[model samples]
Target chain A: IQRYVRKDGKCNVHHYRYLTDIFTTLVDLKWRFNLLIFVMVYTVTWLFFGMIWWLIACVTNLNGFVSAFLFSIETETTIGYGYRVITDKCPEGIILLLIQSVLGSIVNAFMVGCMFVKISQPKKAAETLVFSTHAVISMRDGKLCLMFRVGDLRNSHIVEASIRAKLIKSKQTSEGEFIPLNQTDINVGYYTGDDRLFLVSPLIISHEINQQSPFWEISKAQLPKEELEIVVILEGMVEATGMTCQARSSYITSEILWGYRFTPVLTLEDGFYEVDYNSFHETYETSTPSLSAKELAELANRAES
Target chain B: IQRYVRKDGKCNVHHYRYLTDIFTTLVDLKWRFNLLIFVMVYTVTWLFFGMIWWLIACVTNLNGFVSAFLFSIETETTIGYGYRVITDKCPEGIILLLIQSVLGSIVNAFMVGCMFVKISQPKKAAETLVFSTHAVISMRDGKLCLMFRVGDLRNSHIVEASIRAKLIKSKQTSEGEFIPLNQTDINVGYYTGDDRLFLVSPLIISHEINQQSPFWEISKAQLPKEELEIVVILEGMVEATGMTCQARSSYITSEILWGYRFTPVLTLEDGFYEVDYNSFHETYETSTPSLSAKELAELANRAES
Candidate 1:
């Protein structure tokens, strides 16, 4: 039965959704391809041998696809029975079988090695922190203050991380030109390799953040039109030098969208914050594909798909 | 508002059913860990260098965090900036900065190299013909037949695939025992590598497959239960001296759980499909935890976030 959409006791959505969710999810494409190779070789060998087996069965009536399959398996494993007695009269057939058998062993060993490697390596931990997002404020005091919570996953390592914050406001230079001030602190509070439970950066905003009014002081809707975008960089050896950077790219927020909220102020689990998103924007049919709200929504949806 | 939710703005039964979907989903886990790494490294470097920037800005007031950030960027890019420089008073600090810069450069270079590798490689084309749950069968010239469709991805790669079909069930023998009469065929349908095209092999089910048959006759639910489960192996290769062998251990049917599927058949983009699933299963997984299903989905979700 399907699981995504109701359709006479079947989830129709399961149809459009590739069977990948149930059947092909764990199958590694490369290995599948590799296995396909093995299948092809075996099939050819079997077909050639099957014909011989068929001829023998037809003439002598020795019923044996199972025996043939078993023989192929035995030959491939190099444990062939010496008594079945392939004769010298048709040496070409036995010679080919020998070659196939050797090749089969090599492929079999290679497959086992691959399986071992997959199980031995640690599952690539999530790049995003269990406790990344927290309400950080800039105080007159030198220290920066912010709270963080992390989620729990066994052996979930935090490794290393960075924090950033910016004050957004329309400001004019002494020369009388309006330019946005991105006085964002890219890193604050936590030190790397220091397996602390949570991030506790002080409310140490840049001096450019006018003390008369701070970014955090303003409300989400009532806040000044000025915008702040901050990113915390996480890095280090991933599962003994795996794809650390790529994982980071996927984990960190690439862009700031409307109504965005960061997650995990602090948690008792493995010392990381995991952000959870609220509602997503919907697209409106438009003229040319503009970066307007509708266009942006369309773009986002496309990427999601 | 969440589109998948109810009109009352609550998650639907399905959404709620998959509770903690963020944590359990393989994709979410992959990217979150990736994010943690990105944040940790960046925050550490930024805080360290942010302090340096603050110090430089504090003492000189000319080069602030902006300058420090710029300096780090320059160092990361392996570009030396002589204009606003670190002073003689902080030799140790300068050394540390240089080390980070070099390290950053190496990381950046590695990322670039990976991007290049991903982009430049010739993409293996997708198969046009699709396979469904129902197997194809035919009655030809008083013989029972079973056939399967297969195709190649690349136009320049000469591909030849062996097709196979196994009768999932069998009749009671004179000894009152059941046996599966699996059969297949090997024919070079497309001998040319110049075109990405089709080659279907017609395999005959030599044994009668009537309404009582497990494969041709009975539905999935009605198949007779047996102590041993039988698996039909499928493998393929390039031209001569290049092919994969079939085996029970590298079962493709079993690996599909968790949203991964291996192609039942394979056509190498290059010259050989000699290496079976075992040959590169671990190697492929080892090379990319980022692109993995569990991690890859996390990456996709993280990017959306």
Candidate 2:
């Protein structure tokens, strides 16, 4: 199934304007590409000045290319050249040596820049945030709801988080026109500000199947047969270094359990809000009615006085 | 006169556990300190290994120190030397060069690591966020409200921002005990959710004064005589790199205009939401009663009943 935003909150964006943030572009790229850029800059810097020195004879492995290459490194380090030597009949090449010295610092500075930036980022923090393996649909206080658990393992928190859900699918309108990849807003909470959470503890967020819900017609049998994508997003001000982050995920039809509820993971223990993350993903079977929300509504209305 | 969080959100911790994140500690430090560490590491690595090579001669010319120092760079690079050649280099001195070559990379790698990390951060996004210099107080729909403007100049936006305020002051309790530097919550909005703003445009966020407000006793005359600090904050996921960012500002009594409102900087022209930021900070005087908020509340209740 296709996803709108990956868990990292990155969208394909197909094309990127890399030059606008070239350092970040280089920084965030793969190791192979980075090293590829590295070798090019290193050799390119060497080759370029080598050619210039060749012009000055700036002089001899006896020929222009080899002679220039030898002179390039020699001039950079001021290492005494026992083997290769420049011509005595030098002109602006004296000033050229001075210029390469200046340019050489910039090149090596950037060269080391790429190396450090590449090596610095560690794999830890490996996203302290974790989501349930699957979403579950069950009756909550006699009403149908779909929910999933989201939690963090680290002591640090994402502050003032707002969780959201979007339902993406094709829908045929009353005018009989098909809307492709149309999105419908799922109200996890608005009037009830449950949409915002204090995520210090693991918690479940739910989208109730009210009359306005796009999932009103969904039945346990029809769910896997009909394709639908729901993207869940968590947006917040992060406590770590005071920055903003949107941690997101996608759930498709087959992944939502029709009659299940998340298992209890919270317990009080010795002045601690002990959480059992090992059981966080576990779910218990619940006796939810298999009727579609629309059918349940009609039946309830018919039975009501 | 005092701020809980400085403009940069750095509090004087006085002491820190640097080793926990020594790289970050070094990365966020100043240039002089970083360069100081640089020289130390460069020379210290040389001194330690030089002493080791001195043990080996790693076989020196005169004393072990000179021979060790001379041999260090030669082993690092395979550059042949004419003058000070090692003597009848005994045994393990041969393999010491290989060991130094391996350790040299790790040293230079971290050396360049510190360099790039130091110079990598650019000042371009010098905080695209801008906050109004002063806060204003005036009648909005016949009620006292305090407001300050916050805006962004960049093309990007801070996603789903939640703005907040805290009032910091020293107050005497009912028991006549002084509560020093006590913080009180100032409601920008919770039920109204106006606390959340779409910050694409420069907008004024208001904290309305009601009986529950901490500022109910504040009068135009007493405002400056009293000392109080208000910290306004914007917390949200930033669009630029999909990261968390919290932009904040502080307001003191002296910086608050007793009877004023912000000038309108938003206008429509040629299919544009044209905003003149030059006027973004400009405030206009509003006709407002000089009564204390407590007096205004009592008067309104009496009139209504």
Candidate 3:
């Protein structure tokens, strides 16, 4: 069957696009091209209005066409250089001058706003924040747990940042309705209260596979067979602009590794925490057994008896 | 205790901003304002360029100032009216013509692109999506469940729509870590596959407070004291733009009514289906007992025995 959910947990774009999609495309254009367009727009506008003033000067008994062009520039720029004046004889000049001034200010404001928006987008910060390539199910304190990692590549932190994760899967409901996908929260460090992680460095987020968990019944072998995606979301205020930014990523079952552990990217050196990104995507085989969370829980119960 | 999750489910914006945020704001402006600004920008640019041609004609002793203004219009619009030409005899005029032509084209392309982006945004459709003011908990086929309603106010349908809900709560973990909030999904009609709603009419999304539910342990009496929020998200493709539109709302514990049911809003009359928006937010007392889901489930099991 064709799966509606992609491995990355994003919907197919063939049938849908976001309204903000155009901004994305525009932002993606090369800076040089963007600048070129901006410059051309301003130049064209400046010259076009100048031509109107030149015509006004020619039609009237004005001194020279150049003076009219100069007056056009002065009026549009709001400089009002008194030498080239629009006299009472030219009523059209006065009316056109008023319109040009208003139009010029509006255009300037819009162009400036667009430029600011284009330059200050928080895409860089979002791009710098990274998630683990794969989620892993492994032993944490002798209990089987699902784990993932999130890190920031910059020293400039995302202020007031928070993270969340969801397990999304397609299910057939009791009413004979088949949902394309249903989302369930994967509480990371729920029992330990570590869900709000200080992500100055790489932080491991773990979800306990207890009885209440959606994955409580699945075995390690069964996990690979499951068609599910784990979507991770991180939101924070950008330190620079005081604006909110959200970053998201997802890992499908195939992208989840079992019985593995992420390599340490942080260590104390000279009394300061040092991050080595070379091992960012690296992992190692852990002592975690290949048993499912339920099987391990059952074993633990029996041993306690 | 201060709640970490905002009532709107949006992140706090105290520190950072994104370039795209301004674009979004611009897009959200009234159509009249958008159009006015757009028109003003183009008009200003056209006049500005026309002034440049007038200046060139004045300096080069080419032709009448009116002809120069016409030449500016022709070059900017690419009309190429040969009656007024910037000849090679006036090298400055020729150079100005080349610059104006290139700048005009670039500005024209950019303005058209901007207009297209502004006009095609899918926000209007999303705005027409209405949600019930409060979530209701009542008996559905003898099972206590949580429910809310969503409806489309437009005749044009949003295609491939899906809804998701999250129960967000602030909690202190065993390890002394305080999470601002945790999210748990509420699956509506999960077992029978009713989650992918057609959205032609109203849809009652529900979450069963079963043993595995986060709400299973919360009694009706205890619900009022709980500080929690439920965020609902609906996403769909707009039929007109083929773009994705997302609508969202949130309900706190006080906003969820126990022993309540939504009044019927959809009815068949005169061989046609009609929706009464007057009753969209209307609710009435139901026969449901004010008992926790777990209590009802247990009582049902005992009666079965």
Candidate 4:
């Protein structure tokens, strides 16, 4: 198993592979599919309209490539607040005009729908996690000050990120399930690139979750013999030093609190590794007989299961 | 002072000029800015990476663009599953290769973010009131049908229309609130036409509202006479037909149900005519007043302040 964690306790990861995430598929598909669709639809629509308008101009004896492109756009938008009107000279061209108009409306509808569906999907929400959880640390007042770094991986953007963090017990229901929430308080890193850059989050999670933390039912000190797990959640195509991420967090239990914790102490068996909040359970159950479901059922049946 | 069943109605004469929709300026300006930024960023990033990769490729003697574009996509995607390895012959191109890879990752992130924002904005939501309530006419078998004539005035879209109709009440609340609830039955009239087409609804308004009808609370024999505000909602845009539409049904007492119920019902007033649904008020009132005070109070207060 591999682990990833920032200096701050807030952003942590425990995983076998950083890139193995459910949204990973989505990110890949979206990148390729969206780019393809936009390129195809925009180009084709532009060309179709361009040809029609150009023909109209040619017949009307006012033809030019630039004029045609402009006219095509105006007509495509249905913004016929007309500076130029189709004249009688190009009566045959009106049919083409009408056809172009129909095609244009359909194209517009398709694009709008695509755009809405693409943005409203669940994958984009990952940006918050990737941007907020990363940070750089420095000493401050005998403590640590962390700054988160962030920049556009893309070409054109005046992008702004809204970040927040909080330390709460990872949510688990009576069903014995754990789910990660996206809220960060630590700003332990900052984006260090030029005008074109990426985002980095600086962290100092010790301010919240510590060795003897209240949020965790069991303190990290008492969890030396126990097992634990950590997870990270982000939105939309998270990238690291060189790896492309699909909204997955990679950190391990033993990495926090100045490495006071030990391993197998938190082994990755049964899918997720387990950690004793204060390192207690391993010692207590080291010699215990394995309780199979049938044995447990015998006990439950004895209790009237 | 105009009234419909003692409910006053009015319409203010105001045209939605370009000044009112100043966002139009931002639309063009933002497009240009975005275009400029994207171009510059692409060129700079491309050249920067190209230089690095070119140096590496030159030293190693490898093909540049094919390697850069292909390798960049593969590496940024973290899918190094291909056999196209950078060779010692193309060793110098390694810098260019890595630059493209890194830049590609950033571009992916930027593009994803962009797609996210574009798809989420409210402006993309469909808001064209496309239905034609007036086009709905009854057939011999008590079926309701609608007609939609295309051929846009702006000649942009060879517009099409799908229609739906519902019966609503006309009584005013004690607080003068006219609350309308949708009837259980929704009649969707489907029609598609390039130049012109009309849809017909065959479903009878089971309990058609008549003056003394149970559809209305008024006593059957004592019901006040008035026009039925039959509304038709369209799926696509309708060509702007010269017509009058009102914000308040009660505001226009005399003509709430007057005029030809079609695509274009002109409201000629004070030497000017407005198109259907374009006006702020469609008065059924005996005394024709303009627009509404529903939103006037805020303006009035602002003026006073």
Candidate 5:
């Protein structure tokens, strides 16, 4: 089965056809690589500008290049150690000084911006909000519901946290048009605001297998024969950083456990509720009807009383 | 009507209920506020540590407070200006020095991280990905298509760029369940890879009105009478920063035009294709069927020959 979103929450895209995509290429670099880039970028600019200054005053010796580089650093970083001064001797050495000075500022800002973005990215924060290893389908409040658990490992709560799900499958509409890899929105109590998770603890996110649900036609007997994927997205802003983070996980047909429920991981202990992460992904077998929602609804239609 | 997400793509969440949400509060602060906080955090730590040093050496000069602060700044910044030194005159001063040294490092790193995030955030990049002022419904390939334009003002192309649309409205399911803010997925050709745009220029994203589409029932007559919102989300990793940017826009029932198509803004110019963003949001009247998809399909059913 093909998956649009990988189980690890990434997409495949190797067709970047532009050379200017280098800034993000640098941004995507690891800490060591980014630091090396920053170091190289700053040093190269300083040395290159220093060369210009060295060229401007041809009477200056080889040792003068070292002084020129030091002056360039002082000029760029604004350290201005006062030992170096650009005298008005060549009438227009002042113009080169001005040009190099502004160029130095631009280089510094861009390099720092790239370096900071490298370290301050929120992707690592997304890793802290994890999904269960498997999704479960079982009876809930007299109706079958597909459920999955999402656990937030960070001590602080996520602001405005919400969860969304999409069912990816091939289907032929009533019009007989075939659509492969079609995505259908799977409601998770969106109207009731249950999708807005507190995330204070690991919570079981459920999808009621109602008439609108994509799983309404799936029964325990039919589940193993089905080929579909349910992709879940959990998004929120980190309280510590205010940067939005998104975590995604997809459950293929084989990973969706029928007649099962997520094991509870919450316990009231003393003044605070203890949220245990050890049982976050664990599920236990539960009693559920083997009938599909369509079958169950048809049976209910016969007895409205 | 209550909107979960505002037009500017923000949410309402005042019930933080925790006092420790200050880090994000600091993060949310603008450039001036954050810079002030950084200065205060640094200055106060220096002063606090300097007080400890002064208390350690009570036998020093009447002007000892100034010297101690200078030494603290020098030590904390690692500038080591070569003027001050914390000698081994006090054996345990080394322990305090080490404690303050580590504390200073922590403060500097956190402050710099917050500051860099403030300046290097991708939210600003999101603003560059503009959407059309209105959604238009028009005929395309003998089918009604809900079309909207998304323009990337940035010269560099975004990586893994994708578009998604959700139709939000109140609904009563066949089971007599009342849902106030139901979200239905409106496919933007997900199965055909049309949702993933090259974004080399402004593109008109289209949603084919089919039996499965949420807008299948919406026609020129019913559209004006309906109370619904179509929220569009354009998400991608900006090539300049590699940070993911999300731009959200919503077209209410009143904002959707019944029969219109976006004006063509592309023209071949020299070695490249010229994309004129001046007409990005401009739409022109176009021929379209006033009948809903349901009506259109029924009409076709009678003439299957």
Candidate 6:
């Protein structure tokens, strides 16, 4: 019986492996190496087919190996330059040319698709989108809120960008059955209508620990000890390619800072707004209530009574 | 006023663009191109510094252009090599040497950092993890479930892979305020201890639209017409590099299929289990009721009474 959660808040082990994993290693290699390997594959395929053509010439009335190899290249490329052509003088040679032409197109198309996929991958764009390394518990408009910053590292913005956050925690039902991790949404100003944040500049996403928030029951002290994760996600279309890209980061209890606030990263210079990335991950000390929203709610009820 | 929803279900235009956008284009370029650009930048920098060193030599007791260039390379590389030392006899030359050493290290570090980032991006591994093109609404253990498949295209497994699902939608509050979009977590058996899915093979992730689900009030007919998106996220550490990789996909109403089921991609052969990727995206028709879960629950109460 192995435990599931390791000290780093990750699952301990995986049970399986797949062929796609090996292909990914090849894909991650330097693009120059991929190009070399692709050329090698093309050459090998051409030689294999050329050998077949040479063997057919041995039995038929065609020319030698060099002519057969030239014929194979011309046929595979669909060039048919007429200096060398597969003729009906050898029926096997004609059939081989037909097969080579079809397979050649398929192989060429596959290589093109691979290159397109490699170049168009959205991850490269997502890399310019960054999240604060640590989330902070700080006051916003006089209320304690969970806050984190997200910023676009590039000069061009992601078009139509949207953001969302979720609090995931493990729970046990009343029936004594354990429910793995359960996810509950943190409104993140959704009801207040401020959820649409333009990420052209650095922006702080705040989730108020109101009555509806999942964090309402946990005190500031307990927050660091809680078995949970807050996952933040941002999605948008890359302006350069118009392809969708998503960036995500998760913060566990240990990664959340209490009694802290993010330092201002935006400044006005000569009537223009400029973002100083040096302050992007910087935070400052701030005072906050140690009580949970649930405790505060109980205190309000007692006063009313 | 511009509409919030675009034709593709995204929000309207971004409000601003930054200069940082050009850096991302370079980041996304083919690694071979990046290498070429790095070399070009290095050459340009060396020539720029070399010319400056030559100018400094003209005012001092040092040798001509070629020796000046050699001296610049030695100083920039911090090799100093005594024979070509920037003599204190020329105060301007000494100052130039100090400045060049610092700037040279900075430029070298910057290029090396770019190369490191390009090669070590976690997204390459994430690319090997893919989700089914369309999500399917089908039956699972006599209950309707909104399901989709996720598969690893790799021979190596992701360590401690975990998955989550969220329903994102725009809403108007009772106060007449517009909330751009809200995210709600759908418990996808993460609790019942089934959350850790081994992605070594294709795995189907299903979310039951029960009472707690946001889809509890939506029937099959209303699903496609609803302004909503189902976002699925998968996160894991690469077993080889130990870097975290995250892959996410969002399915709008148009991308979800009702009354359909995925074909099995797993097979048993000669006492070994194998996965057939051919059937990974293959699904077939299945019968499902049109009633929403809320309506079904009410009908059940009426019948019981």
Model 4 collision count = 105
| Docking model 5 quality class | incorrect
Chain A vs. true chain A, TM-score per model, equals: 0.41, 0.75, 0.81, 0.35, 0.88, 0.81
DockQ for each model: 0.01, 0.05, 0.02, 0.01, 0.04, 0.03
Best-to-worst lDDT order? 5, 2, 6, 3, 4, 1
Stronger candidate by DockQ (4 vs 6):
6
Query: What is the iRMS for every candidate structure?
Result: 31.4, 11.4, 12.6, 28.8, 10.4, 18.6
Off by over 4 Å in 1: A1-64, A82-85, A120-124, A127-129, A132-233, A238-305, B1-305
lDDT of 6 by residue, B1-305 (tens): 33334322345556725556766676678866765675566556667887987766423235545455434544564433344444466667768766887998787556555544455567666767778888887555545678888877654446346788877788888999887767888787655424555443576777887888888888888886788877778887664443477788777787788888777775556544466778878887866678787786677678964
lDDT of 3 by residue, A1-305 (tens): 44344433356545435566665665667878776765666557767887777666523333444445444544565544233445677677778877888897776555555555554466655656678888888775566778787866654445235678888898888998988778888887443334544444566677878887888888777987988888888776543333456677888788788878777675555544466777788877755677777777888889964
Can you write out model 6's per-residue Cα lDDT over A1-305, one digit (the tens) per residue? Answer: 22233322333323233433444455456799989988897888889998997677513235666766665666566554445532234457534543464356445644664565466666677778888988998667756689999878997758457766766576653423233444555677555556666776889988887777788888888886788877676666777776666566777788789889999998999999999999998998866778887787677678964
Clashes of each: 86, 7, 40, 105, 0, 19
Give model 6's TM-score versus the native structure: 0.50
Whose TM-score is greatest here? Answer: 5
For candidate 2, write residues A78-174 as lDDT tens digits: 4636465433245556446545644554467667666654554322232566778789988887688999998878756564677877676765544
CA lDDT, every prediction?
A: 0.32, 0.67, 0.66, 0.33, 0.71, 0.66
Q: Tell me the deviation in Å of residue A12 in model 4.
A: 23
Ranking by TM-score: 5, 2, 3, 6, 1, 4
Best by lDDT: 5
lDDT of 2 by residue, B1-305 (tens): 45555544345235455589888887787767765675566556656767877666425343535445434544453333433345444767777666878986676567566666555553223256667888998776567888898776653334346788888898899999998778888998656445655444566777889888888888998898988888887776444344346677788777899988777675555543456778888987856889988899788889964
Q: Could you tell me how far off, in angstroms, the CA of residue A296 lies in candidate 6 after the best superposition?
A: 2.6
Which digits, one per residue and each the tens of the lDDT, describe model 1 over residues B1-305? 11222212233345166676533332234434533443454445655765665564412223334445434433443333333345667556567676777776564443333332222212111121122222223332322223232322222121223323332223567898775433222221212111111122111112223323333332222322322222322333321111122211111222212211122222233433221222212211111121222333344568954
Residue B203 error, candidate 3, Å:
2.1
TM-score of each: 0.27, 0.55, 0.54, 0.25, 0.59, 0.50
lDDT of 1: 0.32
Where model 6 places Cα greater than 4 Å from the true spot, the runs are A1-33, A58-71, A78-95, A189-194, A300-305, B1-305
